[PDB]
Design an enzyme around this catalytic site. Sequence first.
Site, mmCIF file in Angstrom:
data_model
loop_
_atom_site.group_PDB
_atom_site.id
_atom_site.type_symbol
_atom_site.label_atom_id
_atom_site.label_comp_id
_atom_site.label_asym_id
_atom_site.label_seq_id
_atom_site.Cartn_x
_atom_site.Cartn_y
_atom_site.Cartn_z
ATOM 1 N N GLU A 1 -17.893 10.731 -9.213
ATOM 2 C CA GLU A 1 -17.685 9.526 -9.997
ATOM 3 C C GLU A 1 -18.815 8.569 -9.670
ATOM 4 O OE1 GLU A 1 -14.011 7.443 -9.721
ATOM 5 O OE2 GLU A 1 -12.756 9.261 -9.875
ATOM 6 N N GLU B 1 -9.521 10.634 -4.360
ATOM 7 C CA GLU B 1 -9.586 9.394 -3.575
ATOM 8 C C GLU B 1 -8.370 9.175 -2.665
ATOM 9 O OE1 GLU B 1 -10.607 5.995 -6.036
ATOM 10 O OE2 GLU B 1 -12.593 6.824 -6.448
#
Length: 305
Positions: free
Chosen positions: A240, A133
Amino acid sequence: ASSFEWFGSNESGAEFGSGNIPGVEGTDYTFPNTTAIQILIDAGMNIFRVPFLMERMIPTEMTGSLDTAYFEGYSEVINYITGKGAHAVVDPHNFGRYYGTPISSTSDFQTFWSTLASQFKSNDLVIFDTNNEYHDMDESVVVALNQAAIDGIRDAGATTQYIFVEGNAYSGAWTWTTYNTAMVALTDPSDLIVYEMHQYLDSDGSGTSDQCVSSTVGQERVVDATTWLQSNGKLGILGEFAGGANSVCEEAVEGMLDYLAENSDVWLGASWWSAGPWWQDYIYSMEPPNGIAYESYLSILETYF
Ligand SMILES: *[C@@H]1O[C@H](CO)[C@@H](O[C@@H]2O[C@H](CO)[C@@H](O)[C@H](O)[C@H]2NC(C)=O)[C@H](O)[C@H]1NC(C)=O
């Protein structure tokens, strides 16, 4: 057999207590529980993503040497997973940042990745994840860092492993075409790049609430990313995702995975966030025997593998 090539879970613990670096194993962080991993393997899961902190793995400078103790604890989990035939995702869970500062050195980052990938180069069940991320950084830097990671991994002789690349803006599927179309330019001499995106179903996509926007918001949030993968001849993986223990979230998760499975020509699979031994009553815990998501979602997820 299965809806996807891969379906599994994150295995969290080694990235915990990030305010304490290096910190102390068993106090600030822990490594995942291989017996609990085996329970998920026995259920049918075949991919496990294992977060760690860059600063604990290679302290002080990205160009430095491994911390032997942290690397050995981490690789024991990796090797357990691959020893059972499952893929293990090596995830520097660092948000594009090293000691809190955005990474801006492609050459330093490449060296970090050669140092780490050299330790796994003969294990073709290891998957490398360039960084968790990236966010609030320049897009050209994020693309260049992903390329520097690929270069370092392949330069170290780790040429058989898939590489999961991640975009800016938390690599969200729902914002992929808004921020991350420039990620199309990444190259790999082994041609094993997979675009790893994340998708949560609460209002801000942060995955901090057990409430989802609607029973259809998951499918809605992966359509554009799917079109982009198909348009550009790329492969993707939902590295995710999660939802709360309620019918709206469960239907949203189901509808999203249904859509990905319908488009399995580009979606190689998905991995839940998250399992691991230190989650306690976490709204998304996939850890057996009693994690909230283990109780509410495991039989739903088994529909797909
Ligand atoms: C690792 O996971 C295993 C499996 O969930 C845990 O083992 C359970 O442990 C309790 C207490 O020790 C036993 O009463 C159960 O019989 C065990 N279950 C199984 C299926 O083996 C173990 O405690 C975990 N280790 C940790 C968290 O450090």
